[PDB]
Design a protein around this ligand. Structure first.
Ligand SMILES: Nc1nc2c(CCc3ccccc3)c3nc[nH]c3cc2c(=O)[nH]1
Ligand SMILES: Nc1nc2c(CCc3ccccc3)c3nc[nH]c3cc2c(=O)[nH]1
Ligand SMILES: [Zn+2]
Ligand SMILES: [Zn+2]
Lengths: 360, 360
């Protein structure tokens, strides 16, 4: 495979489906990327993560540079070998999870991170998709503050580009995505997009959302922001999200997603189903012999009842977390698969309508 | 298969290897039985428990009659269906884990348990091997107190026998083991053995050990106690134990074992190896790329390093508990397999010697 190749196989409106080819494998888009926060997708072996249909996972940099350390993972052969995942890994740049003394050089915190060091750490980890080091602007933000932050992010985006390119092994084997900022303001999003395209990246994330603004506002910002990005490159919406957020963002041109919700919200008792989320701890499930979801093809739904998983989560048993997480990540992969197939077949707007009617 | 058939294929000294055939499967002896404390072997899917080589698991009654409840599990189709384990299950009688108002009728506690109710609960759970309801005499015990307790246990053993036999479905499909008491006193062990043999059971446990007496004392008691039991029936040492305790008890005629050590001690960071236990949290493992144990055939040792599992346990990650538990239970199964093969081949005393030289 090439270092990086994105091909669009089909479109419907602003939605696209395709593939990203990279040395360690192919990524089907639109993609949902399970999150590891300490070199593990919580409660799952990597073979299980793969079996659910994941093509790529997200490595949580901030936690790794602290524990176990970037230099240490490198000495041990890199993150892929360390955790036993041999397919692509996207790493965030750390410029969110830290936010501390902030300067134009970078951030020091309760340690230092700069564009250069972030890119280096992602290199030590053996990341396949490297994120530029950005500032994720707090919400709400005044226009002046959103602009100052965006501007700094764009300067940092150029420093990221040049650090990456200045490391031959990384430049030849990994990909680099830039991150658009600008809060909810169209003119700053446009300036950000322009600056990023001028620098040039392998992919473009929409950053600064999923920071408490609410679905209507996020979709509004996506309406004008995603078309500002190069069409022929992948669009990653960072930190999104719930099933419904995913469908509406694909409708707005996003190709890639990460959420901690399916893992997080699963160990908490929330299970996703096509009729909406359920909280399996609810007493109503205590004698319910049905699987978590009636159509789901995952191994959990093949083998265990709601009543058992209810008992497990209520009891604080680790297998409860294992099964809820497997199910939720499988659910998400099956959602992505239905989205891809529906776009390929030119019926995604109908799918999205049918999905929402039932989910709500 | 029959309801219950124990066949001895080979012997060496007091050690025996063979098979127990029951309707839900065959149990290779000497046997190690992983423990579930709430209808789960902690951190493992049943398919994983099986893959490690377990032929039978132990259902933790005390926890189940409280959570989720015996009647509830019965309504849901029984423990096998509920937890997804279709092979034999041995259940303890609850007469240990409770110890509260104690009487000749049974015990009430912070609920009631009597010989009759214990047998009924094990029935509701769908247990394959039912344990008699006993009193596990505290250690140390004076001779008078050990005798009083033993005597009560034997009366309860007759009540257990008769409750079991009085329930046709249970009597036809399950097995019943009696439990010898008598603390560390030979004459009370003998009285207990006689009383139990007179009643007659499918198997005989040695109870009242693993209660803080220490290996030398436990082995001393086993030296005289196990020969008192019917030779042609299985001998179960309850609550034992460490790898070394297992080898010496097989040398003394025990066929079956349960310990919470491999599960318990695994999530705590203790890993069993043929060179003895290691605590994987120790800093010395932080960059150790070797598997937990150098010969172990388990999937954990095939795929992950000490350094990674060290990181996981240090980080409190659930996959750390999953991998340490899989390894430790696999280790134990491989121990049992080496014990069985060595007895079958008439070299178990050499195995035991070689095992100890290296383990210590
Ligand atoms: N770099 C960056 N990250 C964000 C994350 C973390 C996503 C992440 C990816 C991979 C691993 C961990 C975390 C956000 N989460 C919610 N909203 C978010 C916004 C941003 C952002 O604007 N920039
Ligand atoms: N009934 C009984 N149980 C014991 C257990 C629990 C084993 C058990 C089996 C199956 C499930 C849970 C617990 C002991 N543990 C350590 N020493 C023990 C002694 C006894 C005993 O004398 N009688
Ligand atoms: Zn499912
Ligand atoms: Zn192993």
């Amino acid at each position: 495979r090439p270092r990086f190749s994105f091909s669009i196989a089909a479109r419907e409106g602003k939605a696209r489906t395709g593939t990203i080819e990279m040395k360690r494998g192919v990524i089907r888009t639109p993609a949902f990327m399970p999150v590891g926060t300490a070199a593990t997708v919580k409660a799952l072996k990597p073979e299980t993560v793969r079996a659910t249909g994941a093509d790529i996972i997200l490595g949580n940099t901030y936690h790794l540079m602290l524990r176990p350390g970037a230099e240490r993972i490198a000495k041990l052969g890199g993150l892929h070998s360390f955790m036993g995942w041999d397919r692509p890994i996207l790493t965030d740049s750390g410029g969110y999870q830290v936010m501390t003394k902030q300067s134009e050089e970078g951030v020091t915190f309760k340690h230092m991170l700069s564009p250069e060091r972030s890119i280096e750490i992602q290199h030590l980890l053996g990341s396949d998709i490297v994120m530029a080091f950005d500032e994720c602007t707090p919400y709400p933000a005044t226009p002046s503050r959103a602009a100052s932050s965006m501007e700094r992010s764009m300067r940092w985006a150029k420093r990221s580009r040049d650090a990456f390119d200045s490391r031959k092994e990384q430049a030849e084997n990994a990909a680099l995505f830039g991150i658009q900022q600008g809060s909810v303001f169209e003119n700053l999003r446009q300036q950000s997009a322009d600056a990023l395209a001028e620098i040039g990246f392998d992919g473009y994330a929409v950053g600064g959302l999923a920071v408490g603004e609410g679905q209507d506002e996020m979709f509004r910002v996506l309406d004008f922001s995603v078309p500002m990005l190069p069409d022929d490159k992948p669009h990653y919406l960072m930190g999104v999200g719930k099933p419904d957020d995913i469908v509406g963002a694909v409708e707005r041109g996003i190709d890639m997603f990460d959420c901690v919700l399916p893992t997080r919200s699963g160990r908490n008792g929330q299970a996703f189903t096509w009729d909406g989320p359920i909280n399996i701890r609810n007493a109503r499930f205590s004698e319910d012999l049905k699987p978590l979801d009636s159509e789901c093809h995952c191994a959990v739904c093949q083998k265990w009842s709601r009543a058992y998983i209810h008992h497990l989560i209520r009891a604080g048993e680790i297998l409860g977390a294992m099964l809820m997480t497997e199910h939720n990540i499988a659910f998400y992969q099956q959602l992505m698969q239905k989205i891809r197939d529906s776009i390929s077949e030119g019926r995604f707007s109908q799918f999205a309508q049918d999905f929402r009617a039932r989910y709500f």
